[PDB]
Design an enzyme around this catalytic site. Structure first.
Site, PDB file in Angstrom:
ATOM      1  N   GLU A  32     -38.917   7.625  91.960  1.00 48.54           N
ATOM      2  CA  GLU A  32     -39.238   9.034  91.926  1.00 48.54           C
ATOM      3  C   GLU A  32     -39.481   9.524  90.506  1.00 48.54           C
ATOM      4  O   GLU A  32     -38.809   9.095  89.573  1.00 48.54           O
ATOM      5  CB  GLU A  32     -38.060   9.795  92.529  1.00 48.54           C
ATOM      6  CG  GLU A  32     -38.201  11.307  92.604  1.00 48.54           C
ATOM      7  CD  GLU A  32     -36.931  11.979  93.096  1.00 48.54           C
ATOM      8  OE1 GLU A  32     -37.046  12.904  93.925  1.00 48.54           O
ATOM      9  OE2 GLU A  32     -35.807  11.599  92.678  1.00 48.54           O
ATOM     10  N   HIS A  34     -39.274  11.485  87.206  1.00 51.26           N
ATOM     11  CA  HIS A  34     -38.147  12.112  86.546  1.00 51.26           C
ATOM     12  C   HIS A  34     -38.647  12.766  85.247  1.00 51.26           C
ATOM     13  O   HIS A  34     -38.070  12.572  84.187  1.00 51.26           O
ATOM     14  CB  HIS A  34     -37.006  11.119  86.275  1.00 51.26           C
ATOM     15  CG  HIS A  34     -36.059  10.930  87.431  1.00 51.26           C
ATOM     16  ND1 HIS A  34     -36.360  10.136  88.517  1.00 51.26           N
ATOM     17  CD2 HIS A  34     -34.814  11.415  87.657  1.00 51.26           C
ATOM     18  CE1 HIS A  34     -35.345  10.143  89.365  1.00 51.26           C
ATOM     19  NE2 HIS A  34     -34.392  10.922  88.875  1.00 51.26           N
ATOM     20  N   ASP A  43     -32.774   6.639  89.822  1.00 51.95           N
ATOM     21  CA  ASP A  43     -31.881   6.764  90.968  1.00 51.95           C
ATOM     22  C   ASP A  43     -31.368   5.428  91.509  1.00 51.95           C
ATOM     23  O   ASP A  43     -30.438   5.425  92.307  1.00 51.95           O
ATOM     24  CB  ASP A  43     -32.552   7.545  92.102  1.00 51.95           C
ATOM     25  CG  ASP A  43     -32.760   9.011  91.773  1.00 51.95           C
ATOM     26  OD1 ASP A  43     -32.365   9.466  90.682  1.00 51.95           O
ATOM     27  OD2 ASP A  43     -33.291   9.789  92.575  1.00 51.95           O
ATOM     28  N   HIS A 118     -29.804   9.260  94.987  1.00 54.64           N
ATOM     29  CA  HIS A 118     -30.957  10.147  95.193  1.00 54.64           C
ATOM     30  C   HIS A 118     -30.564  11.203  96.222  1.00 54.64           C
ATOM     31  O   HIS A 118     -30.300  10.886  97.362  1.00 54.64           O
ATOM     32  CB  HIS A 118     -32.130   9.297  95.664  1.00 54.64           C
ATOM     33  CG  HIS A 118     -33.341  10.059  96.098  1.00 54.64           C
ATOM     34  ND1 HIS A 118     -34.052  10.889  95.261  1.00 54.64           N
ATOM     35  CD2 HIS A 118     -34.018  10.038  97.272  1.00 54.64           C
ATOM     36  CE1 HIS A 118     -35.097  11.372  95.906  1.00 54.64           C
ATOM     37  NE2 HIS A 118     -35.100  10.869  97.130  1.00 54.64           N
ATOM     38  N   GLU A 120     -31.679  13.370  98.248  1.00 57.98           N
ATOM     39  CA  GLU A 120     -32.261  13.462  99.583  1.00 57.98           C
ATOM     40  C   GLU A 120     -31.862  12.369 100.589  1.00 57.98           C
ATOM     41  O   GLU A 120     -32.090  12.526 101.791  1.00 57.98           O
ATOM     42  CB  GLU A 120     -33.796  13.462  99.459  1.00 57.98           C
ATOM     43  CG  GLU A 120     -34.401  14.702  98.814  1.00 57.98           C
ATOM     44  CD  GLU A 120     -34.453  14.657  97.294  1.00 57.98           C
ATOM     45  OE1 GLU A 120     -33.710  13.855  96.696  1.00 57.98           O
ATOM     46  OE2 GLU A 120     -35.210  15.476  96.708  1.00 57.98           O
ATOM     47  N   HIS A 176     -32.058  17.553  88.531  1.00 60.04           N
ATOM     48  CA  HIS A 176     -33.023  16.486  88.753  1.00 60.04           C
ATOM     49  C   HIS A 176     -33.754  16.311  87.427  1.00 60.04           C
ATOM     50  O   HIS A 176     -34.517  17.187  87.014  1.00 60.04           O
ATOM     51  CB  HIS A 176     -34.040  16.786  89.861  1.00 60.04           C
ATOM     52  CG  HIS A 176     -35.117  15.755  89.944  1.00 60.04           C
ATOM     53  ND1 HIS A 176     -34.845  14.431  90.213  1.00 60.04           N
ATOM     54  CD2 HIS A 176     -36.447  15.824  89.703  1.00 60.04           C
ATOM     55  CE1 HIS A 176     -35.966  13.735  90.164  1.00 60.04           C
ATOM     56  NE2 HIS A 176     -36.953  14.556  89.857  1.00 60.04           N
ATOM     57  N   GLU A 181     -28.486  13.306  84.504  1.00 61.55           N
ATOM     58  CA  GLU A 181     -29.158  12.012  84.643  1.00 61.55           C
ATOM     59  C   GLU A 181     -29.656  11.480  83.295  1.00 61.55           C
ATOM     60  O   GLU A 181     -29.578  10.272  83.019  1.00 61.55           O
ATOM     61  CB  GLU A 181     -30.340  12.105  85.621  1.00 61.55           C
ATOM     62  CG  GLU A 181     -29.932  12.308  87.073  1.00 61.55           C
ATOM     63  CD  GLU A 181     -31.105  12.205  88.029  1.00 61.55           C
ATOM     64  OE1 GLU A 181     -31.034  11.419  89.008  1.00 61.55           O
ATOM     65  OE2 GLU A 181     -32.092  12.924  87.820  1.00 61.55           O
TER      66      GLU A 181
HETATM   67 MN   LIG Z   1     -33.935  11.713  93.164  1.00 64.90          MN
HETATM   68 ZN   LIG Z   2     -32.735  11.277  89.872  1.00 61.59          ZN
END
Ligand SMILES: [Mn+2]
Ligand SMILES: [Zn+2]
Ligand SMILES: [Mn+2]
Ligand SMILES: [Mn+2]
Ligand SMILES: [Mn+2]
Ligand SMILES: [Mn+2]
Ligand SMILES: [Mn+2]
Ligand SMILES: [Zn+2]
Ligand SMILES: [Zn+2]
Ligand SMILES: [Zn+2]
Ligand SMILES: [Zn+2]
Ligand SMILES: [Zn+2]
Lengths: 257, 257, 257, 257, 257, 257
Positions: A32, A34, A43, A118, A120, A176, A181
């Site tokens: 994904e 970032h 992630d 992650h 979701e 996010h 992170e």
């Molecule tokens: Mn993610």
């Molecule tokens: Zn992430």
């Protein structure tokens, strides 16, 4: 001796399961976007590194991580319209978790920690566990136990939260590609982060509803939901110790020797 | 600059796809017993290392590998009754490939190389491709092209085959945990192989039919289908160069600049 | 008395199963192009005829055949882009096999031979079996046994091969609509073959990879992978005797009285 | 020339479809108990024979029949608890019909008659059709037309019924293994029926509800829902001519030259 | 005390199941056009009202109804091309019935009446039941019993049929939005019917075959299959009592105290 | 005129959709334990009532609600081990949402609001939406827009929260069967709540992970996550007015007249 199942021979693995109270850990990530300043496998890298450290401390083993997760949602990952983000359907992710649990049970394993990286993924992991446990019951197996967690939820100490977010905590969804992170990546994989490329926008805000098809205008252009401007290696080290210690303690409590 | 998509930012990836002739590569492996002398992630490690080398040479990018593959079959992987081997159902693997192709197409990618490392995956990869191409055709997209291969098939040179198999090539299926994979592992990841633990047995033989449930007695005890006694780092470097060169040439032919 | 389940009454079938050691056989074919000189139901006709003869010899019963199989692949059946070829999705074929096994088990049957007639079907047959056995296990049934074979694997003997191919055998990889199937058809159903229509093209060769969408240029125009010019009734009679004997022997070994 | 697609070469089939108004016919049956006096493949044999005759008359082609159908229901086929009856799950049958239509459409065919021979199949045939038409609509295709029919619905003319049942007609809800099917079998496949084994019981009756699991006591012991004692070759010949004529006419009306 | 599960607390429900002979009832309907004179939720409202009255009489409980059902068919509901009609796929409806049965079994319930109100639902309800019961067997549960019915089938008395259809009963298949449903609605929910809007056309007739895609010209314009001009509250009251009495009696017989 | 689609004729519905700006609303609930003091259909009743009022205000229409939702989770609904709670599998819920969107689009509708009433449904609603929009895109349709919201998210105002929780608000995480839902029920359906049965326990707290199988001890005995002792009709009236106004405003913004 490696804590990664993939790095063991089948005999070594068999012996470890044969010992009786073996804990297995499975990182579940995503590929994904970032933002402009960090790579796309965050992630996977983060929960895997946390699993590794926890496994080292409690004598657990870590399975090959899930590299692809559920569709990015605007309010927690920027949205699935971004390039690079490569997402699975819910049925696929659920089925993957289900298949792995079935196989671990076949091996004789009865203790699994699913560590989500992650946002979701959670509910699809949950459905995979439920369907797997249902099947185990059909086969007369009732002693398989699963602990599922997202590693960031272990960062609860008000003092730590203030160190990371001096202007206030905005939720794990809006984190996010932000301070949390990025700080972790700076501590673990500095070559994969370029802090100079961070775009310092205000934290994303949204109305109390969601719109589909996802409207790109509602996500900050760089794809991040909050700025990692103040991210630091030092912050990463603090996060890492808190998560590793907290999770190690939780696993010991749920899966005592 | 990394050849791994996971190590790129979404902007870097977007730019590479925007260039027009970007080739993406997806390693497809397994977590599977590989005898007493080698670890269980071989089928991910090998195609990934080959993809990396090929990508460096032709300017391609490599996607995160599929870590779990189809059920081990007695005649090509020892059998799915071994501990450690952790296999997906066919629908799960097929759906994973399908989902990934859908997403790459969304990005604007139109060229994909699927590099298989686990013998049993092939037909599920094929179905995944077909279902994904069917969906693209629904949206009027007909210019997505896929090349699928198992990396060992590129080792055809008699001069090379004779070094590896002096008494005759007996097939890529019986090559499970044998001279080919073990040599490659000695060259690439020597710490994950211990040649002194190799059980030297005569190559497995099977009747012209299969039996289910799988009967463990028909697989050599250690799980290998052929002895890796004569495996060597040298042979590994030979295999590696032949595969890398051959695959790079094939991709250049199928996906010209 | 017929050996076909379809031609028995339910009482006759029930009595045969009640005897305790009843072997059931299921032909699994396809509807697929087989060149200019031969009809499209070959892959059903051939295994069905072999099953009939084996069943007659060993006292087994034959189930109605699967008429539609998995998608034709360029290297084994010419490719699914041909007209006439009518193929199932993998999940459909897998589910059909699964359903039939579940029902046979309900009848009290415990011995099944799946005789494949279309190469591409194999892995979907395997998945169907595994899923069915998994369910039987949930129901406490662990004594259902399945033997799966492709009838052509029983033409092993080099002495038989020399007889059949005096000008030299070029391999099984090109035996789609070639000498092997065509000879069998001349022996069994001569009216369904017109040898004068055979296109005598050079045997098909391919690179060590596959491409999708399938490129029709890589398949010989007629759809055959090799020339059936030298096929004969006599070759077919030999194949039939050899296959029937070998399979009968194998089933008696795996499923003794 | 044969009216069976399976007996044509791919070139012959291609040419028939290329002509423009080609009608294809697909028999859909079952493997199901049909009492003490008749074999279990009736539901395939009958529609197939009617299809053959209709095709001969109108210049149509017949596809390989579906050999396995949906679960027998007590009120229409005696129930799925009988031995011998081998039934598919709904999704399997639906999927098979769906896959076949997809493939026929790929060939360029646009006219299909589905001829059902097993009462219980109907709604799953309907769903398979809808799902295939849905996919065709994604590609803008709306000219694929399907006519679905159960062959017995063409023998409902009271004057005809008077000829077939002079003593009195008891209704169609009870015509499983009774006078209708048995008479047709006596006319077409006399070797597969033994009238002397008919168990002459009173017509089955049921309350206006169904119970699951199915209670075997509620079906007549032999499995038939009505007695075939008065079945005859003559009745079969009348049924056959009436069905063929009516269906040929209906197809000519819906699919004109 | 309410007879609707949804209106009970979990403690009240638990106590009723704990009593040991608790009967649960599940209305299964549809959202579907019902001509110019009546609303679209008829197929939910009617079986729900019947369930309520039966439940009151026999001491049963009624579950929340299924609001969406299988695709309307031309010969039984006008066809799915009408606006308003909102239909599920077969797999969806089947799965819904399956999930609910699994859950009721978890609660300890062992008695379920499925009361269908939409003609087309039946076979998908049947499949849902079969799949649920199959799973229960895997869990060692064999004492779950299901009664399934379409409420109109309990109107059997020739005197009642004649009151509704003095010119003759043509079948429950052609009864869509006609005298039967409209009369019940007049008795139960008069504000949802406007008899002045009935279009008094001749009853729909159909050939002994079906055509797809559904052709709108073959259904009477208003969507009704027969005229409800003679519908009345008195007739509705008659129907209601006959159905309630009949079903109550049937359930007392199948699920005795 | 009713705002409920089920209470309209198909002509009335067609006309409303024909206006070109019609907004459809779908309540998505659950059948779930809600403590000792309240009934189990709360999650359907509440969003349905909000939808009704919103639709009256903005001229929208409300579809029949989803009565069954995703499996209750310990931290949000007490857990799926409680009696009465009757939950769907994720694929079932996803499929139901997907089917309904397909059908609404067929009618010509292009504006949908999904109003969720059960926390656990969220991600399966999201997947159903995605799959439906994916299918629309296959048909070149990209103008169907969906707004998804949980009605409680519109109680934002700290001044409203102060009125509702004068002794301090402890968060939405514990609002299952607590003050919020109970107050709403007291305002709308007082006969379905008995405040005297409220068990006044302390708010539920949980560690930062979840365990499966669910451990019942971690949920307060009554099933509520907070005490509804201070719930009142007046609080319900305030929540209702606030939710209705906010949602009406949001919908007008996204779907202007
Ligand atoms: Mn993610
Ligand atoms: Zn992430
Ligand atoms: Mn392998
Ligand atoms: Mn073939
Ligand atoms: Mn039948
Ligand atoms: Mn209806
Ligand atoms: Mn809830
Ligand atoms: Zn390997
Ligand atoms: Zn063939
Ligand atoms: Zn029959
Ligand atoms: Zn109706
Ligand atoms: Zn609630």
């Amino acid at each position: 001796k490696s804590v990664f199942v993939g790095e063991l021979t089948w005999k070594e693995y068999e012996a470890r399961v044969a010992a009786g109270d073996c804990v297995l850990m499975l990182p579940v990530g995503a590929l994904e976007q970032h933002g402009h300043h960090m790579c796309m496998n965050v992630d996977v890298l983060l929960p895997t590194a946390v699993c590794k450290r926890v496994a080292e401390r409690i004598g657990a083993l870590v399975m090959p991580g899930l590299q692809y997760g559920y569709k990015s949602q605007q309010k927690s990952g920027g949205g699935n319209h971004f390039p690079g983000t490569t997402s699975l359907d819910g049925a696929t992710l659920t089925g993957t978790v289900q298949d792995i649990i079935r196989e671990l049970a076949r091996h004789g394993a009865r203790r699994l920690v699913l560590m989500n990286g992650h946002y979701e993924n959670s509910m699809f992991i949950v459905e995979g566990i439920d369907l797997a446990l249902r099947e185990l019951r059909y086969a007369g197996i009732q002693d398989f136990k699963v602990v599922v967690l997202s590693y960031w939820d272990f960062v609860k100490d008000p003092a730590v939260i203030q160190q990371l977010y001096p202007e206030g905590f905005l939720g794990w969804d809006i984190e996010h590609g932000g301070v949390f992170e990025t700080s972790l990546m700076l501590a673990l994989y500095p070559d994969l982060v370029d802090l100079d490329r961070v775009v310092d926008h205000p934290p994303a805000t949204f109305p109390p509803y969601d719109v589909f098809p996802v409207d790109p205008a509602r996500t900050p252009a760089p794809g991040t939901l909050s700025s990692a401007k103040t991210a630091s290696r030092e912050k990463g080290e603090l996060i890492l110790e808190v998560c590793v210690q907290g999770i190690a303690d939780a696993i010991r409590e749920e899966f005592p020797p």
